[PDB]
């Protein structure tokens, strides 16, 4: 109980702030997470023994992949973090409990491949979930790591509290599809614009609670700009290894996925900030104002791309 996880100086500061980068030494990342959850949640929040047992559990359904990997899991983890400690009292004990583990958990089993190249090839998840396939797969992932024995970090939960946790996680994993992200943020634009956004409104929560995982999903483009082209690097090498895969179907991948595109990445990257990141972080700060530095970081980043094609790097 008077066991507290404690960090470096260096990261001790910087990993309050949202561009914080967890670095490349793995064996630090469980005491990174669990020192969030500790400063986000409590030290009582979940039993030390049952969290270290979850968190390695975790880590090990997690695969050797360039991109969709344990370090992301726990760099949108961060992310999250971030938000819920800029935004102190507007996240109930539930949802601050329910939302990191959501983030840690949100690509649970990932094998680097979109939901459509699973649809295309017929691979059976595609059968078993026929929209958000890999989403429903992390949920249920989730689960099965949640009844494992002495994996239970929710025991000391009501059996209602219980259900409201799992609800939270489960539609926490789902707004992680992409595909999902454009309506729900159209949604949150209306209704703050039109001022019927209302947070005691549990339907308007579950919404605002979809835009921060989208937010932290994406956090890729917020970070310092060696961050952010790195990562990219490994982002564009799933989706060439997907494009490669779709080439063996008999399928021309989409360029975005095309290994002999490279040329149109800068171009393919402004696409991307203009019609996912910046909305998404404009939205985010408009709901949520103290999240202006990852709109702040993202818009930076849209400039560094700029450059990047007028041959200036
Ligand atoms: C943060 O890191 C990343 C890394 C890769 C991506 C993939 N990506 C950018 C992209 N790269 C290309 C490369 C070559 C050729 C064409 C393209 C292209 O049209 N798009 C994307 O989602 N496009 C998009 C465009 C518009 C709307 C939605 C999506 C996104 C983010
Ligand atoms: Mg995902
Ligand atoms: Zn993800």
Same mark, same amino acid.
């Given at each position: 109980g008077?066991?507290?996880?404690?960090?470096?100086?260096?990261?001790?500061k910087?990993?309050?702030? *949202?561009?914080?980068?967890?670095?490349?030494?793995?064996?630090?990342?469980p005491?990174?997470?669990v020192?969030?959850?500790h400063?986000s949640?409590?030290?009582?929040?979940?039993?030390?023994?049952?969290?270290?047992?979850?968190?390695?559990?975790?880590?090990?359904?997690?695969?050797?992949?360039?991109?969709?990997?344990?370090?992301?899991?726990?760099?949108?983890?961060?992310?999250?973090?971030?938000?819920?400690?800029?935004?102190?009292?507007?996240?109930?004990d539930?949802e601050?409990?329910?939302?990191?583990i959501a983030?840690?958990?949100?690509?649970? +089993?990932? #094998?680097?491949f979109?939901?459509?190249?699973?649809?295309? *090839?017929?691979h059976?998840l595609?059968?078993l979930?026929s929209?958000?396939? $890999? !989403?429903?797969?992390?949920?249920? &992932?989730?689960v099965?790591i949640?009844?494992?024995?002495?994996?239970?970090?929710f025991?000391?939960?009501?059996?209602?509290?219980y259900? &409201?946790?799992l609800?939270?996680? #489960?539609?926490?994993?789902?707004?992680?599809?992409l595909?999902?992200?454009?309506?729900?943020?159209?949604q949150?634009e209306?209704?703050?614009?039109?001022?019927?956004?209302?947070?005691n409104?549990?339907?308007?929560? +579950?919404?605002?609670?979809g835009? $921060? $995982?989208?937010?932290?999903?994406?956090?890729s483009?917020?970070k310092?700009?060696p961050?952010?082209?790195l990562?990219?690097? +490994?982002?564009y090498?799933?989706?060439?290894?997907? /494009?490669?895969?779709?080439?063996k179907?008999?399928?021309?991948?989409?360029? $975005?996925?095309? #290994?002999?595109?490279?040329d149109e990445?800068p171009? /393919?990257?402004?696409? *991307?900030?203009?019609?996912?990141?910046?909305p998404?972080?404009?939205?985010?700060?408009?709901?949520?104002?103290?999240? !202006?530095?990852?709109?702040?970081?993202? #818009?930076?980043?849209?400039? &560094?791309? !700029?450059?990047?094609?007028?041959? !200036?790097?």
């Amino acid at each position: 109980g008077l066991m507290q996880f404690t960090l470096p100086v260096r990261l001790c500061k910087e990993i309050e702030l *949202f561009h914080f980068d967890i670095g490349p030494f793995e064996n630090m990342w469980p005491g990174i997470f669990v020192y969030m959850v500790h400063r986000s949640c409590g030290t009582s929040c979940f039993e030390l023994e049952k969290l270290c047992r979850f968190i390695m559990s975790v880590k090990k359904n997690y695969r050797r992949v360039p991109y969709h990997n344990w370090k992301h899991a726990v760099t949108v983890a961060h992310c999250m973090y971030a938000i819920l400690q800029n935004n102190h009292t507007l996240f109930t004990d539930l949802e601050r409990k329910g939302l990191l583990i959501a983030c840690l958990c949100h690509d649970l +089993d990932h #094998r680097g491949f979109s939901n459509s190249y699973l649809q295309k *090839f017929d691979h059976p998840l595609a059968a078993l979930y026929s929209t958000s396939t $890999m !989403e429903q797969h992390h949920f249920s &992932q989730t689960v099965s790591i949640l009844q494992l024995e002495g994996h239970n970090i929710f025991s000391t939960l009501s059996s209602s509290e219980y259900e &409201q946790v799992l609800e939270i996680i #489960r539609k926490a994993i789902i707004a992680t599809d992409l595909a999902l992200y454009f309506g729900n943020r159209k949604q949150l634009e209306e209704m703050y614009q039109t001022g019927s956004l209302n947070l005691n409104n549990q339907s308007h929560r +579950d919404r605002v609670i979809g835009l $921060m $995982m989208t937010a932290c999903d994406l956090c890729s483009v917020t970070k310092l700009w060696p961050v952010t082209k790195l990562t990219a690097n +490994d982002i564009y090498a799933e989706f060439w290894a997907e /494009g490669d895969e779709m080439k063996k179907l008999g399928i021309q991948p989409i360029p $975005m996925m095309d #290994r002999d595109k490279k040329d149109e990445v800068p171009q /393919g990257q402004l696409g *991307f900030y203009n019609a996912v990141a910046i909305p998404c972080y404009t939205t985010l700060t408009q709901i949520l104002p103290p999240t !202006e530095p990852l709109l702040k970081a993202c #818009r930076d980043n849209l400039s &560094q791309w !700029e450059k990047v094609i007028r041959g !200036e790097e």
